[PDB]
Every structure is written in structure tokens, then in C-alpha cells.
Symmetry: D2
Subunit: 380 residues, 4 copies
């Protein structure tokens, strides 16, 4: 657990303050009415929190993965949707940060400098290509000084609102994991078409888009890296995304635990607070221990990523699986601890349980993350 | 597993047909728009399915608990809310059926004969008295030929719409489990006041009421049984309710499993249906086995109830805990099996997961049911 | 749950009596000193319990699978090793009963009539061929009126002591699942060689043999069924074996539960029996519920087998997985309930935990049984 | 995860070397023949490893709790019994180190300086007083310049061989948690009587003693701290013991995992190493993740102890519960991964499963540790 710099400590104190005073009171309505977290996005921009991994060279704060992880745990505590904003925003920029040419980085990252409110998105998933990302069908054909892109993407977080989308497509279908390339695609490009914004079980304070590319021309200079390196770029981006999912899950689990704990102190049955009942003590014990274990695995994984350590793949996969499992279990149980009240929309913990489910599925499902982990352990 | 009579087999074939053709297509909208299942209630009345435990002597079909259990499994498969209608309807009548005088039974059960569409409710729970039902505060004072009732109830299923409500109240607070009595209270009684219909995580195709009794007079002849027998009447009603909860949970789990199974056969990743993947096979195996185990425990418990066998308490408690746990786990996993699509409202399995949670809480939580089970095993 | 005949009820009362009075007092020593259960084998022969599935036509009692299952639950309660005797004995005869010609059945089953004490064994597993039984290397070559058998088997229960062993071997390696045949091999055949009797974690009141076949000649008329039908014969025998494993596991779990229950009533800490502590009540609840669920799944599977119902494969696989898992969990927890004393050899429950582990592995491991179950559900 | 000093790094490299080259080859025989680990005890003394928490002031290395934890993880990897030697040795000295007067510390700790091979033991548990330590019956009566001790202890690790035993007894039964005192008792004191060395499921390379005190006189100056402070001294010693149990459990789990991993790489079924099978990958993933999570919780708890941080109680309780649970699960599964071979004594992983069970029970059971954890979270 690296010593935090004073800059990190100040950032995290401010995040905890904003989470408590501004984010938490909004979260019920954000879910109830399925709202993009505009107020949060605007506030985060003003405070320097929207783009924490943007490099200093492009006007960013370049905080590192550990810092963003800690931020995600604080936000996930109170609003999983508001955390997801930060995950999608950082995700959409990471392919350019780590693959783009000097020229491309300057061209497209400058607009995110400072208090910019512009948004990113990452578009890899397709109806045909979820866990099997190599099955994606979107194609990019070189024609002169342009690529012509045809296909579709689904479940794209912020897709319909992103200024800049990183699209993965095949430039050579025959070469498989060596035939995918990655492209910067700007909002307003002719041929970019938005589909439905789908209705979800949870994390409803969000945008979940279908994209279509119909003879969509992008300049040749919008390619990220060389042709055929896009699958490795995607896999590297996912390695980091998984740690962000894990951090958000740690937060979700903690926020539900905190509400369970307070309920046990306040709710009297059989003549005393229910905290006095040994089975409630046992439930809270098991909940807190899994959150703490998940927190430690997640912080180790984030540190390994910042250090550029090969082991980050393994530990990030174990942190994603364990912290999401833990958020699913702990939230299920925190609803239980609140009894009837736990099932009521007004008390929040039902939303956190709906939110928790997504963390088992996105950034790759927990069956894929178990594959990645097992492969890394058995075929080192 | 008793041989089913031909009357039971015909009933269950008809229920399966109605569930498939009429109930299943309605369930998405029932949840989305938070609708009482009026069409179902009216159809069930016409078909003789609304009041299966009403005795023949009062114009009812007197099917028994095993039959209703099987019905609940079929309905829960497709619409947990529509099953809950039948649970609440039977629950609200069981205190009168098993405690009321000949005169009271005739007076209040006759109106449920035949194709009646009138509704019942059972009102025991209070803000102060959830697991600790002995902590209820509602009071009934004898004044002449009337009782004067003052207090409140919450989480009452169908409360605001029931023609007949069974209210539990203290007639002698000092005598504890011997000082509660039970009362028939009619819709339209001066002093009966409805509160909010609360918004729930799931089973939203339902009514969940707060009741208030403000100097509410009921005739002395509306008491169910003698003064002070109401706690035993309540405990007996819960013994049976628990088996109905278990049956509904079995159905929920089965309906989610069925959608998972079909998805594995249709969804191709890595070049074949995902059914070909051994981890998916393992998930479905574990899901199906827990549903089947829960189904068997539930059918044994229902049979013991019909037989009047003392062991029904023990087995019903084990069936409630195990079938609700199983619905929570199996639905959580069926969402998982559908991946991203599983999280989308349009595909149903997210609702079944929200519905499943309630089965762990109502009719007594799974911590209370474990207490009941453990007590029965250790202090036989 | 079929009504038991009076013959089955008498048999099971006698088994319960023998288990309690004769088997239970011997079990500690049987494990401690790694003893074949000779006294049990001899007593079972005298009482008509050694060979319950031997057909009447060959002097046997022809009890059926349900009866043997119930017997296995009673024996497993007190001595898993003594149950295993009955499993191995029946297993070794089932290939002949269900595959052998009239002539072969008369030739080799007659010697098991009545109070015979002769033993059987089933020899399929090899070092190269455990879960992958198609990888077996043992070969049988037709030479005139004989087959010449060369290879080896391991983990063969009773192998070195069986009068009659059913050996599976390839008669045509190129035909795979159609190139295995099955053979009766008699104790005393030149070329049959015994290896080590290996030392096990549990079920130590048993014999676990390595067999070698060195140019071992058997008469051509010792083949069971036609050449190449041996893999189907083996798979059918395993379908039934799995239900016997499940029954034994149910017994193991029950016997450990019973000792836990009694300990909670007798062991006083904090001034009362520990049965008074809600967490102990919860543990015992969860234990009893999983035993009961496993018991019901096992009895359904056995009935389907007796009825010749295709669904027996599916249900037997679910019963084996669930009842063995349950024995592993329940015994682990029954040791826990006894605290320090639970870890001591003198109190029995540590042996039942060591015994329980085997039930997850033999008759095919719980990963294979999950494959079988999942395949049956997804590819019906 | 504090940076390790170069002294800690050298110590741990040496421990890993000794564990691998000297401890691991001995462990099978140590269990098989129930041997005290004399060779290890003597080697550890020579290398400065027997008494790592002995203060420098008394000739000790004063390594701290973190160092001993890391040592325990290395030893537990290969021999749980040899780790337990170090746990018992440190435990028996900690009451004197942290409670004894200057005079008492010099009098009794000097003999453990340097390469001493003398042993300690901690004697609190009684037949009447396991989880309920306040129920202990042993009494110490002041008579002049002596205390007269009468009672008994059981499950005392190294009890019959310890030169110095710390005995807890009531000096004032009426004062409860303020009426227990702690005493140094020397081997050879008239009135100290040894009972049986009991036979255990696992950790059989150990001594597990019953002690009796029959009018046993000890000098008044052998009291540890003032009269009535012994319960707090005991509770503080247990807080630290729990972290040592957790560390040993982490090691047990790791050692079983390592053998599972190697087996998957070497064991071929279905034509490839079983590592290729996705279900095996999943099992190993879940195993490794729980070991890593337990490792992190344990290292955090040990650091908090070294830092004198109040939170050590909470984290040590969560580490003990989680690391022991994990050793029980991971070893159960590592036996599974080795299939039939996993059940055989020669392959080691069955012993580690038997060893693992104890870690759930000793230093306080996992039901008590859950109570401690839950209390700390709900009543901070
Ligand atoms: C693991 C997988 C199934 C690929 O496995 P397969 O069995 O098919 O393929 P394979 O044979 O193992 O590998 C092929 C080649 O890849 C290479 N390579 C591998 N790893 C590499 C690495 N780390 N780095 C570099 N390269 C790596 C290999 O070395 C190999 O190349 P080779 O033959 O030349 O050596 C992959 O498609 C996957 O991750 N799917 C999960 C879907 C998912 O994560 N979706 C999340 C979407 S976003 C989200 O949800 C959001 C949410 C919130 C808001 C923001 C977003
Ligand atoms: C178990 C409980 C905590 C009582 O335990 P406690 O520790 O406080 O009390 P105790 O000391 O054990 O017993 C006191 C006396 O009771 C008697 N007695 C006991 N059992 C009896 C029996 N079976 N039969 C007869 N009598 C029985 C005892 O013998 C004893 O009397 P004694 O001293 O003279 O001998 C109880 O309040 C409970 O069940 N709460 C759960 C709440 C719940 O279920 N709410 C569901 C609401 S509806 C719902 O949710 C819906 C959903 C869907 C739509 C429709 C509805
Ligand atoms: C499942 C298995 C892995 C075969 O799967 P694979 O993926 O390799 O092969 P596959 O492709 O699925 O099938 C090949 C062919 O088989 C046929 N067929 C399949 N099922 C059939 C059925 N039910 N009936 C008839 N036929 C059945 C198929 O239809 C197919 O033929 P096809 O292509 O012409 O259509 C198999 O080797 C197995 O069970 N291993 C577990 C080891 C085990 O149980 N050992 C226990 C040892 S004893 C013990 O431990 C003791 C303890 C106590 C004391 C006493 C003993
Ligand atoms: C938790 C327990 C049940 C006491 O709970 P109860 O509900 O009965 O009592 P309570 O009411 O909570 O507390 C009473 C008073 O205690 C005080 N106090 C509490 N904690 C304190 C602290 N940390 N520090 C200081 N003081 C602490 C309280 O503040 C309170 O005082 P107050 O009223 O004046 O304020 C206790 O007996 C226990 O730990 N049993 C487990 C047995 C066990 O661990 N055995 C392991 C044996 S060794 C082993 O196995 C080996 C293996 C390997 C080789 C080497 C060895
Ligand atoms: C709200 C939301 C936001 C998302 N945001 C992003 C985004 O911004 N950008 C983006 O590109 N994508 C995004 N994702 C997509 C997401 O990563 C995927 O849904 C996920 O990879 C699963 O793919 P799928 O939904 O096609 O499920 P499938 O791959 O069809 O999985 C179905 C089931 O099969 C199992 N399965 C599949 N393969 C295997 C295997 N080899 N072994 C064992 N089991 C397996 C899965 O675990 C699952 O249980 C998001 C999804 C959602 C729902
Ligand atoms: C939608 C809905 C419909 C319902 N329908 C009916 C109805 O029609 N009529 C009716 O009367 N009631 C109804 N119930 C009420 C229901 O049975 C209760 O909510 C349930 O008993 C729990 O009570 P509570 O919500 O007060 O939770 P609490 O009793 O406050 O429980 C809080 C937590 O403490 C735990 N806890 C409490 N006591 C113990 C104990 N002794 N040991 C261990 N843990 C314990 C609980 O398990 C829970 O985890 C319904 C509730 C809901 C939400
Ligand atoms: C005491 C004892 C008695 C026995 N009695 C009999 C007897 O009388 N006669 C007889 O013929 N045999 C007997 N068996 C053998 C027994 O059935 C096998 O050990 C069992 O099939 C496993 O084979 P294996 O030990 O080779 O393990 P492996 O097949 O090597 O398994 C190693 C691991 O790989 C996993 N694995 C293997 N294949 C797959 C797959 N396709 N998918 C997922 N995971 C998989 C397994 O589940 C296990 O976890 C007995 C074994 C024992 C130990
Ligand atoms: C091999 C071995 C070595 C040991 N070494 C030491 C040693 O060197 N010195 C020493 O003093 N002691 C030693 N211990 C003792 C050990 O700590 C105890 O056995 C342990 O505290 C449990 O006590 P018990 O065995 O009396 O079980 P009990 O306290 O009788 O427990 C029985 C069951 O009740 C449960 N239970 C008890 N109280 C509660 C509660 N309040 N809430 C919920 N559940 C509860 C327990 O968890 C357990 O499941 C050792 C024990 C063993 C077996």
C-alpha cells in the first residue's frame, strides 16, 4: 500500500467531501429518473476530477491508476452510476494515451485539457462479439487518405454523447488477433448513427448506446497505432478497466455495508438494537471481511499497473472477480439486513444491489476473468 | 410425492396453459407499470383458481396445500407478482378458515364463493413489529358489543384493496403471546385509513399497503376464536404461508433457469453455442440441481401440511429457506448466463432476480426461518 | 417416494438394528487399524444383505436400487467403509446381471447365491484413464478359444480379494467407445497379479488394489456381451453406482449431523447448552436442510432407476454431486460444532469428514458429474 | 505492505531455503508417525528461528509480528505441524513479555536466549472452558509467599514438554473477568501432572496435552502482573495468536495450491494436461484468489499489531476467519484436483486438508472470531 502523496491525499479528501455532500443526495433521483449525471460531470470538470489519467502534456492531472481506483471506491460508495461516468471517460481515452502517435495524441487529447466537459467512449462490443471480441464484424477499409468503416457496436457506455469514440474494427479479417485496428471517430462524422439507449436493471444514471457505422469515412490519420495492433491495444485497455471495475465494486459493497451497519444500530426488535443479535453480527462480519479483502486485492492490482509490473494482469483479474462477487453478495445481504425496508426504493440499498450485478458482467464477465486468471497461473 | 388426483392434474394442466398463454406475455408490463394483476384476478375467478383453499362448504374448491403449491410453482415461473396475488388471497382467508366459529365462517367466507372477485389481506406486521411480531402495538378494547381498535400495520399485501382484512391486535398487552386476538375487518369500516402504497425493488405488480386504525369499531362477533388465541392462529397461518413462499420461489428459480438454458442453446460465441462451454454446463448443472432439491423439499412440506403432520413446521421452514436462497442464487446466475442482455429489462431475467430477493424476506426472513428450523431440530 | 413393501420395511428395520448394535461400535477400530470389514461381510451374508441386487433366478433377494439406497444411507450413518463394501459388491456384479448371456449369468452368478461370502470387483480405472475412461490401455486379444489380456488397473475396491472381477479392456483400440469389451476374470487365473493396497485419507476399512494382467488368458466365453459393447455396459453400471455413492454420502452427512446435534444438547458454554446459541442453531439448520434435500434427490434418482426411466441419468448425476458436496460440507461443520473435541480421533466425526471427501471423487468426480448433468440439460 | 528490512529479507530467504530443503522432506513422516519436530526445533534454535519475538534485552532477535507471520506462511506451506511449533513457542512467552515485571522477565526469559532449545506453553483452555474462557475452574490461592494452584487444562500444545508454562487461574472467582490471574509454572514443580497426549485428525507432528494441578505450589513472585489482570493478558495474547493462526493457514492453503497447480500441468486426460480444461482453470483461479486475499488481510493485521494500532483486533479477527476458511476450502479442492491420487497419503495434500481443519478451531473458533469482528464493527 504505497504511501500516498500529499496531492493524492488532498484529491481524495475533496472526493470524499463531494461524494458525501453532492453525489450521495442525488443518487436516488439519478436512478429513479434514469438521468445522465450532468451536475457531477460539470462539477468534476471544474474540480479536475473528470479526466484523472489525462497526461500533463495535454493539460491533464496525470494522477495514475491507484488514485483513480481510490476515487472510484469513494464514488461507488454513494452512486455507482457516477463512478461509471469516470470509468467510461478514462477508458475512452486510454487507447489513445497508450498507442497513439505524438501527432494523434496532440490532435485529439488537447480538447480534454483543464476543465473540459467533452466525453469519450470505447466501442469494441458487438451483438456478435461480447466475450468473443475476435468475432467482431465491424470492418475498416483503406481508400486513399481515408478508412471506410462499416458495422455496429452495442452496450457502449456514453456512446451517443461522446465527442471522441475509439472504435475497434477489422482491417484484415483473415489475420484474426493481428487483423484488428483501432480508430478515433468524432461525434458528427457522416455515417455515424445512434440506435437505442437501452433500459437496464441498474446503473440507470447512465447512457448505454448502440452505434452503427454506415459507409463512415474517417481520415487515415485517425488510426491508433499501426494496422493490426488494435487487439493488443484493446487487451491492454481491458487490463486496466478491470481494476476500475473492481474499485467501483469495492465502493458499492462498502456503501451497502455502511447502510446495513447503521440499520443494525438503530432498528430495535426483541427489545434491543438488532446489532445485539449474534446472527446479525456474523452477517456483518462476513460482509466487512469480503469488502476489506476485495479492497486490498484491488489496491495491489492498481499499484502493479502504475508500476508497469507484468503481474498486474493476474492480480487485476483476481480483484475484478473477487470485488464484483463481493459487491453482489454484500448488497444482497445488506438488503436482507434492512428486512422489509431493504426492499423499498426509498432506502437505497436495493439500487446498490441492482448496480452490483452489472460489475459481474461488464469489462468482461467473471467467467472470462476466471479464465484469464487460471490461464496466467497455469501457463505462466 | 402423493399420486395426483385427476382433478388436480386437470387443474394443473389448465394452470400451465394460462400461465404460458395469458400470464407470461403480461409480466413485463405488469412490472414496468406497477400494475395490480386485474386481468389475472378476474380470469382466475372465472376459472376457479382465485380461492383454491376455500372450503366446499362455502362454495370453494378446497384443493389443499399441495395443489396450491404446484399452482404457485407454475405461476412463479412466469410472473412472481401474479403468484403473490394467490398467496395473499389464500393467506387472508386462512385465519378464518382455521379459527373462526361456524357463524363467523358463514358470515365472511360466503362472499368468496364461486367466481367471486373479492379480495382478502392479512395484517400483522407493524413498523415496531416485523420479525418480533409480539412487539405489535395495535390494540383492541372491548366496549359493549364492539371492539375499538387503534394502531397501524405496514407491508400489507393487497391491504388497501381487500374486502376482508384479518387484523391482529393486543386485547391484553400484559399477557404477551397469550394477549393477542385476531379480527375480521371489512373494507368501508369507519376508522380504517389507508396510507401509502410503497415502491419496491420487485414484485411491483402488486399492492403493498400501510393501514391505520383510528378509533375503528368492529362488532364483537368479528373476533376470530377466543381472546388471546390470536398469536397461535397467526403462527399456524405462517407455517402454511412459508410453504407458499417456497413454492413461488421454486417457480421463480425455474423460470429464470429456463431462460438461461434457452440462451445457451441460441447464443453463439467462439464459434458454437455457449452450451458447448464446460463452465456454462457447470453453472446450469448447479442451478438445476438446487431448483430440483428446493422443489422436492417444498412438495414434501406441502404434503405434510395436508396430512396434518407435526413435522410440517420443520420441513416447511427448510423449504422456505432453501427455495428462496435458491431463487436468489439461480436468478443472479441466470442474469449472468445472458451476459449483457441479462441486465436489460426487455429480457425478463433481471425482473425475476428483483422478485427473488423478496422471497428471502417475506413470510418471515431467512434468519427467522433458520431459527425456527434450528429450534425444531435441537429442542424437539 | 414409492410406498415401501413390507419386505423392504422389514429389511430396513433389520439394517437399522445391525447398523446401531453391530456396525457402529466397530467403526473406530475399522478405521484405526485399516481393517477389511470381515465381521460385517460375514453377518450381511447370513442375513441376506451382502448381495441385495442379485436376481432371484440366481438365488438372490433382488431388492432393487431404492432398497439398496436406503440400506446405504443407514450404513453410511455409522461406517462409510462398511457401506462401501456393499457398493463394491453390487457394482462388481451389475455388469454381468445387465449384459451377460444366460450361460454366463448362470456360470458366474450362481456362486453368489444364498449366504455366499464370495466377493466381486469392478476394474475399469487405470493410471492413464481416470475421468477419461476411453484412454484405458488394457488390451484383450482373441487367440482361438481364449482372450489374452495385458494391462493394469488401479484404485480397484476389493480388487485383490474379489473371486470375480469385471475387467474392461480394448478389443479394438481404433474404434474408441465401440472398441472396449468387458470380461469376467476369476481369482486364481495365471497372469493376474496384485500390486499394492494403497493408504488412503479415509474409508480405510477397505481394500484399494492395483491389478496387473500379464499375458492373462481367459476363456472366450467369459466375455460379457458382444465385443465392443463394453463402454456402454460400463456407462450403465456407473449411472447406477452414482446413486449408491449419493446414498452413502447422505448417510455420512446424517451420521455427522446426529453427533453434532447431540453435542449441542450436552455441551454447556456461557451457562447453557450451546444449542441455545443462535449461530449454532443456524449451522444445524443449514446442515439438516442440505441432508434432507440430498436425501430426497437420491431417493428420486433411485426410484427412476428401478422404473427404467431415462431421466435417471440426470437425477442420479444431480444426487451424486449434491449428496457428496453435502457430506463434505456437513462433516466439515460437524467437526466445527464439536470444537476441539471434533478434531479428536476418539469422537468419530473427524473420520466421517475424511470419509466424505472420497464421495466427491469416486464413481466419477463431481466435475465429471456436473458435465454429465449439464450436458443432459443442454443437449436433451 | 511495509518495506522489509534487509535483516527480514535475509531471515525469510533462509526460512524458505530450510522449509524447502529440510522441512518439506520430513513432513510426511512427521504426520505418519506422530513425531514431535525435534530436528526442526534443534535447527531453528541454531539458526535463531525458534524464538523470533524474544526481546533483544533477553538475548532474543526481536523480529516482530510481521516477520513471524511471513515465517509462518513459509513453514505452513510445507509442514503445518512445524509451523505450529513456532506458534506455541511464541504464544507461551508472550504473556511474560507483555505483562511480567522486570524481575520476572529476567528470571524466566533469560533461559530462552541465543540457541536455547527450551520450550514454552500457554495453558488457558479447560474441559469446562473452551470458547467460554471465563468458565475456567482452575484456582490459585495465596498462602504466604506461595500460590497453591488446583485444577486442570486440556488441548495444551507442547504442554507436557514445556520448561515454562503460563497458567491462567482464578484468584477471585467472584470477580469474573477481573478475577483471573496468570502464573509462570516450571516443569518439575511438585503437583504438576501430565495426562494423555490426545490423537488428532491432523497436525499430528505435535504434542497436545492435558495438565493437572494437584495442590501445586508456585512462588508468589511467579505471578504475571497484578492479581486480576490475567484475563486482559490472555485476551491480548489471543489477539496476536490469531494473526499467527491466520499466517499458518495462508501457508497451508498456498502449499496445497502449489501441488494442485503442478498436478494440472503434469496430469494428462482427454489428450492434454488437465490445465487445459476450463473448469480446472476456474477452480485454480478461485483457490489462488482466496489465498491472495487471505495473505493480504493477514499481512495488514500483522503490521497493525507491530504498529500498536487499535484496529489490529478487528483486522486480525477478519484475517483469522478468512485465512482458515480459505485453507479449509483450498485444501478440500486441492485434493479434488489431484482426483484419486489426492486421497492417497503419499501425495501430501490429504494431510494438508486434515491440518487445515484445526485452523478453524484453535486460537478461538471461527464462530467466536466472527463474534469479535461483528462486535468491533457494530459497537466500535
Ligand atoms: C480473453 C478473450 C476471450 C480473448 O481470448 P481468446 O481465447 O479468444 O484469444 P487468445 O488466443 O487467448 O488471445 C488472442 C491473442 O490475444 C493476445 N492477448 C491476450 N491477452 C493479451 C493482453 N493482456 N495483452 C496483449 N495481448 C493479449 C494473445 O497473446 C493472443 O495472441 P497470439 O495468439 O498472437 O499470442 C478476450 O476476447 C476478452 O477479454 N473478452 C472479454 C470481453 C471484455 O473484456 N469486454 C469488455 C469491453 S469494455 C467494457 O465492458 C466497459 C465497461 C464499463 C465502461 C467502459 C467499458
Ligand atoms: C418466531 C417468532 C420470532 C416468535 O418467536 P419468539 O422468540 O418471539 O417467541 P417464542 O417464545 O418462540 O414463541 C412465543 C409463543 O408462541 C408460540 N408458538 C411459536 N410457534 C408456534 C406455532 N408454529 N404454533 C403455535 N404456537 C406457536 C410458542 O409456543 C410460545 O408460546 P409459549 O411460550 O406459551 O409456549 C415469530 O414472531 C415469527 O415467526 N416472526 C417472523 C415474522 C413473520 O413470519 N412475518 C410474516 C408476516 S405475513 C407475510 O410476510 C406475507 C407475505 C406474503 C403475502 C402474505 C403475508
Ligand atoms: C463421461 C465420460 C468422461 C465419457 O465422456 P467423453 O467426453 O469422453 O465421451 P462421450 O463422447 O460423451 O461418450 C462416448 C460414448 O459413450 C456413450 N455414452 C455416454 N454415456 C452413456 C450412457 N450413460 N450409456 C450408454 N452410453 C453412453 C456416448 O453416447 C458416446 O458414444 P457415441 O459417440 O457413439 O454416441 C466417461 O469416461 C466418465 O463417466 N468418466 C468418469 C469416470 C468414472 O465414473 N469412474 C468410475 C469408476 S468405478 C468407481 O469409482 C467405484 C467406486 C466405488 C466402488 C465401486 C466403483
Ligand atoms: C471472546 C470471549 C468469548 C469473551 O467474551 P465474553 O462474551 O465472555 O466476555 P466479554 O463480556 O466480551 O469480555 C469480558 C471482559 O473482557 C474484556 N476483553 C474482551 N476482549 C479484550 C481484549 N482484546 N483486550 C482486553 N480485554 C478484553 C472485556 O472488555 C470485558 O471486560 P469488561 O466487562 O470489564 O469490559 C473469550 O472468552 C474468547 O476469546 N474465547 C475464545 C477462546 C480462545 O480464543 N481460546 C484460544 C486458546 S489458545 C490456542 O487455541 C492455541 C492454539 C495454538 C497454539 C497456542 C494456543
Ligand atoms: C451496461 C453495459 C455497459 C457496457 N459498456 C461497454 C462499453 O462501454 N464498451 C464496450 O465495448 N463494451 C461494453 N460492455 C460490454 C460487456 O463487456 C459485455 O456485455 C460482456 O463482455 C459480455 O458479452 P455479452 O453480453 O455478449 O455476453 P456473452 O459473451 O454472450 O456471454 C454469455 C454467457 O457466456 C459466458 N461465456 C462466454 N464465453 C465464455 C467462455 N469462453 N468461458 C466460459 N463462459 C463464457 C459468459 O460469462 C456469460 O455468462 C458493457 C455491457 C453492458 C451491459
Ligand atoms: C412486499 C412485502 C410484503 C409483505 N406482506 C406481508 C403481509 O401481507 N402482511 C403482513 O403482516 N406482513 C407482511 N410482510 C412483512 C414481512 O414479513 C416482514 O418485513 C418481515 O418479517 C421482516 O420484518 P421487518 O421488515 O420489520 O425486518 P426486521 O425484523 O427489522 O429484520 C431486520 C434484520 O434483522 C434480522 N433479524 C431480526 N430478528 C432476528 C433474530 N431474532 N435473529 C436473527 N436475525 C434477526 C432479520 O432477519 C433482518 O435481516 C411483507 C413485507 C414486504 C416487504
Ligand atoms: C479409494 C478409491 C476407490 C475407487 N474404486 C473404483 C473401483 O472399484 N473401480 C474402478 O474402476 N475405479 C475406481 N475408482 C476410481 C475413480 O473413479 C477415479 O479416481 C476417478 O474417476 C478420478 O480419476 P483420476 O483419479 O484419474 O482423476 P483425474 O481424472 O486425473 O482428475 C484430476 C482432476 O481433473 C478433473 N477433471 C478431469 N477431467 C475433467 C473434465 N473433462 N472436466 C473438468 N474436470 C475434469 C477431475 O474432476 C479432477 O478434479 C476409485 C478411486 C478411489 C480413490
Ligand atoms: C489441537 C489443539 C491445540 C490447541 N492449543 C491450545 C493451547 O496450546 N492452549 C490453550 O489454552 N488452548 C488451546 N486450544 C483450545 C482451543 O482454543 C479450543 O478448543 C477452542 O476455543 C474451542 O473450545 P472447545 O473445544 O471447548 O469448543 P466449544 O467452546 O465447546 O465450542 C463448541 C461449538 O460451539 C460454538 N460456540 C461456542 N461458543 C459460541 C458462541 N458464543 N457463539 C457461537 N458459537 C459458539 C463453537 O464455535 C463450536 O462450533 C487448542 C485446541 C486444540 C484442539
Amino acid at each position: 500500500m504505497k504511501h500516498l502523496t500529499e496531492e493524492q491525499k488532498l484529491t481524495l479528501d475533496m472526493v470524499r467531501d463531494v461524494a458525501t455532500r453532492e453525489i450521495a443526495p442525488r443518487a436516488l433521483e439519478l436512478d429513479e429518473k434514469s438521468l445522465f449525471p450532468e451536475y457531477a460531470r460539470d462539477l468534476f470538470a471544474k474540480l479536475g476530477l473528470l479526466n484523472p489519467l489525462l497526461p500533463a502534456a495535454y493539460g491533464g492531472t496525470e494522477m495514475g491508476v491507484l488514485t483513480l481506483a481510490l476515487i472510484l471506491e469513494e464514488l461507488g460508495r454513494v452512486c455507482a452510476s457516477t463512478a461509471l461516468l469516470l470509468i467510461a471517460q478514462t477508458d475512452g481515452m486510454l487507447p489513445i494515451i497508450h498507442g497513439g502517435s505524438p501527432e494523434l495524441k496532440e490532435r485529439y487529447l488537447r480538447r480534454f485539457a483543464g476543465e473540459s466537459t467533452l466525453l469519450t467512449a470505447l466501442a469494441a462490443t458487438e451483438p456478435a462479439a461480447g466475450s468473443d471480441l475476435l468475432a467482431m464484424k465491424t470492418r475498416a477499409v483503406r481508400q486513399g487518405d481515408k478508412y471506410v468503416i462499416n458495422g455496429q457496436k452495442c452496450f457502449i457506455t456514453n456512446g451517443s454523447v461522446a465527442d471522441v469514440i475509439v472504435v475497434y474494427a477489422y482491417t484484415d479479417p483473415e489475420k484474426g488477433s493481428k487483423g484488428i485496428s483501432a480508430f478515433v471517430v468524432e461525434k458528427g462524422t457522416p455515417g455515424l448513427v445512434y440506435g437505442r439507449n437501452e433500459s437496464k436493471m441498474g446503473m440507470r444514471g447512465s447512457i448505454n448506446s448502440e452505434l452503427f457505422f454506415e459507409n463512415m469515412e474517417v481520415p487515415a490519420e485517425n488510426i491508433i497505432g499501426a494496422e493490426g495492433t488494435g487487439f493488443a491495444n484493446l487487451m491492454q485497455t481491458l487490463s486496466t478497466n478491470r481494476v476500475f471495475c473492481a474499485a467501483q465494486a469495492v465502493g458499492i459493497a462498502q456503501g451497502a455495508l455502511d447502510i446495513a451497519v447503521r440499520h443494525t444500530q438503530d432498528r430495535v426488535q426483541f427489545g434491543k438494537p438488532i446489532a445485539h443479535l449474534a446472527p446479525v453480527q456474523f452477517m456483518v462480519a462476513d460482509m466487512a471481511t469480503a469488502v476489506e479483502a476485495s479492497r486490498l486485492l484491488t489496491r495491489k492490482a492498481a499499484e502493479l499497473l502504475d508500476d508497469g509490473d507484468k503481474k498486474a494482469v493476474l492480480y487485476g483479474s483476481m480483484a475484478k472477480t473477487m470485488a464484483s462477487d463481493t459487491a453482489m453478495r454484500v448488497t444482497t445481504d445488506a438488503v436482507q439486513v434492512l428486512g422489509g425496508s431493504g426492499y423499498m426504493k426509498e432506502n437505497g440499498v436495493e439500487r446498490m444491489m441492482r448496480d452490483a450485478k452489472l460489475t459481474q458482467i461488464y469489462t468482461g464477465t467473471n467467467q472470462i476473468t476466471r479464465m484469464v486468471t487460471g490461464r496466467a497461473l497455469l501457463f505462466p
